[PDB]
Amino acid sequence: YLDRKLLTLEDKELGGTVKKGYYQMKKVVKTVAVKILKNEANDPALKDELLAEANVMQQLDNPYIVRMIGICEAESWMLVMEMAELGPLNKYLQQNRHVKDKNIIELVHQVSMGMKYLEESNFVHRDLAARNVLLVTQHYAKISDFGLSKALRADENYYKAQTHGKWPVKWYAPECINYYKFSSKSDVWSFGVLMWEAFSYGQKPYRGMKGSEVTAMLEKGERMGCPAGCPREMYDLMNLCWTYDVENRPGFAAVELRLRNYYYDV
Ligand SMILES: Cc1ncoc1-c1cccc(Nc2nccc(N(CCCO)c3cccc4[nH]ncc34)n2)c1
């Protein structure tokens, strides 16, 4: 738990309510991003989600995952993260349309390294989308938003949800939609959608379609087309991520290899 007296918040709300702040550490100040909830008139489920996020993010340690500073219980309830100051990747690419192919590949490779770590750690993210990739710099991406994430049971490779909730269905794999089963391979499917977004400079996927129409499209074997100017090898990797059968879809170790820009062995 953090000391309210060591936190300064700027008033501007970004996009729970979000503010930038400065948190005084043992020697230096750290720039932070804070999600803020009201103490009494809050939504208990939304607070439960951020407590769940905190519980997950306390167990993670990787350079491509946003680091939590802590929780502050004061005039409001606050979840404090190290700030990735350039913000969400989708918004960044919408506003910066001359980011080069090599640079987009570098960023999505960093996401694949964070996700290879998550997969090794046996956590499922369950909301992997370009809006949840935050940029530290134009050459350094981090994964964020662990509100739906789950620690997998020791005896299974998937989390089974009771039924469909309110979900980011356009990023979800068919086994998620049809059987409510979430594995790291389901996150790989989402990563393919994230790649499409990144090479479409933050356009929304399955534009104009209802979730039910996306399900029917995918079951027929149809997929989003290649973004204008997208490197062919990156569109081919998207299609591999969008393998319908979860058993033939690659895991993140295989995907991460395919985003490296140097020679390697498997
Ligand atoms: C555009 C926008 N909308 C909401 O936040 C932003 C924004 C804008 C610029 C920078 C950042 N950076 C950032 N860096 C780390 C965490 C963080 N947030 C705010 C939500 C970002 O989608 C968080 C605070 C508390 C818990 C969190 N989990 N995942 C992110 C996050 N934001 C954001």
> So where are the chain's domains?
1-83, 84-266
Q: Pick from 142, 20, 149: which is nearest to 88 by CA?
A: 142
What values do phi and psi take at 68, rounded to 5?
A: -85, 135
Q: Which two tokens stand for residue 113?
A: 């390294």
Give the pocket of ligand 1 (CB within 6 Å): 14-15, 18, 33, 35, 53, 66, 79, 81, 83-85, 87-88, 91, 134, 144-145
Check if 11 is active-site.
Answer: no
In the chain, where does DSSP find H-type helix?
A: 44-57, 89-95, 101-120, 174-179, 184-199, 211-219, 232-241, 252-257
Q: Which two tokens stand for residue 50?
A: 């951020």
Resolution rounded to one decimal, in angstroms: 1.3
- Report how far ligand 1's centroid is from the alpha carbon of 32 (Å): 9
With the most atoms of ligand 1 within 8 angstroms of its CB, the residue from 57, 71, 76, 81 to mutate is 81
Show Cβ contacts of residue 182 under 8 Å, excluding neighbours closer than 6 positions.
124, 126, 150, 158, 159, 160, 161, 176
CB–CB of 242/170 below 8 Å?
A: no
Q: Which two tokens stand for residue 105?
A: 């590949």
Cβ neighbour number for residue 33 with a 10 Å cutoff? 21
Name the method of structure determination. X-ray
CATH architecture group of domain 84-266: Orthogonal Bundle (1.10)
Ligand-binding site membership of 14 (annotated): yes
Among the four given CATH numbers 3.30.210.10, 3.30.200.20, 2.40.40.20, 3.40.50.2300, the one describing domain 1-83 = 3.30.200.20
